[PDB]
């Protein structure tokens, strides 16, 4: 029934490579619709933004603006070239490993982001929601990055343990993924 114990690595030749190909497009699109909605209206000063979050756009959504642009013109269109080869995406987490330091910044601002959307952001995003047909709460999008970095660990652990031919780069692609949220805790100072 609605369980997942008989193991279910997705449906198609490229099972879980499709799970990564799809989360690019899901991630660059879900970043797109974020800048255009919640970030747009706070930077365009067209609604009354509570005195706590107005110049705290960079807290509410952190540095998400830099994520869209860089993925839609790089990570996505670099990944679709690996559609025929999930053996080469270990080379892709590493190709940009140092750029993953941006994820250590993102997470350090995450909790204080939370605080501001709870107490002093208020209900303001609920009205914008309905105007554009957002359907989903604000909190959902801004936390998604951390849901996404778990997914990277999910699929990458799959490849590096099951690739009959694991040419290389895979475990390094892993260690970079793991050192980021680890760093954020150690380097706690935001």
UniProtKB/Swiss-Prot annotation:
Tissue localization of expression: Highly expressed in the brain and nervous system. Isoform 6 is highly enriched in the postsynaptic density fraction of the cerebral cortex.
Span of domain DH: 12-187
PTMs per UniProt: Autophosphorylated.
Localization of this protein: Cytoplasm; Cytoplasm, Cytoskeleton
Domain notes: The two GEF domains catalyze nucleotide exchange for RAC1 and RhoA which are bound by DH1 and DH2 respectively. The two GEF domains appear to play differing roles in neuronal development and axonal outgrowth. SH3 1 binds to the first GEF domain inhibiting GEF activity only when in the presence of a PXXP peptide, suggesting that the SH3 domain/peptide interaction mediates binding to GEF1. CRK1 SH3 domain binds to and inhibits GEF1 activity.
Main function: Promotes the exchange of GDP by GTP. Activates specific Rho GTPase family members, thereby inducing various signaling mechanisms that regulate neuronal shape, growth, and plasticity, through their effects on the actin cytoskeleton. Induces lamellipodia independent of its GEF activity. Isoforms 1 and 7 are necessary for neuronal development and axonal outgrowth. Isoform 6 is required for dendritic spine formation.
Subunit architecture: Interacts with the C-terminal of peptidylglycine alpha-amidating monooxygenase (PAM) and with the huntingtin-associated protein 1 (HAP1). Interacts with FASLG.
Something else known: Called DUO because the encoded protein is closely related to but shorter than TRIO.
Family: Belongs to the protein kinase superfamily. CAMK Ser/Thr protein kinase family.
Protein name according to UniProt: Kalirin
Species of origin: Rattus norvegicus
């Amino acid at each position: 029934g609605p369980l997942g114990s008989p193991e279910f690595p997705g449906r198609k030749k490229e099972f879980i490579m499709a799970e990564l190909l799809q989360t690019e497009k899901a991630y660059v699109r879900d970043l797109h619709e974020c800048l255009e909605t919640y970030l747009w209206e706070m930077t365009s000063g067209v609604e009354e933004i509570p005195p706590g979050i107005l110049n705290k756009e960079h807290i509410i959504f952190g540095n998400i603006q830099e994520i869209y642009d860089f993925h839609n013109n790089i990570f996505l269109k670099e990944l679709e070239k690996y559609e025929q080869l999930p053996e080469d995406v270990g080379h892709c987490f590493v190709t940009w490993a140092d750029k993953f330091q941006m994820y250590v910044t993102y997470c350090k601002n995450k909790p204080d982001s939370n605080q501001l959307i709870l107490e002093h952001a208020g209900t303001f995003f609920d009205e914008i929601q309905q105007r554009h047909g957002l359907a989903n709460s604000i909190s959902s999008y801004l936390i998604k990055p951390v849901q996404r970095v778990t997914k990277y660990q999910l699929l990458l652990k799959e490849l590096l343990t099951c690739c009959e031919e694991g040419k290389g780069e895979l475990k390094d692609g892993l260690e970079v993924m793991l050192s980021v949220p680890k760093k954020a805790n150690d380097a706690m100072h935001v």
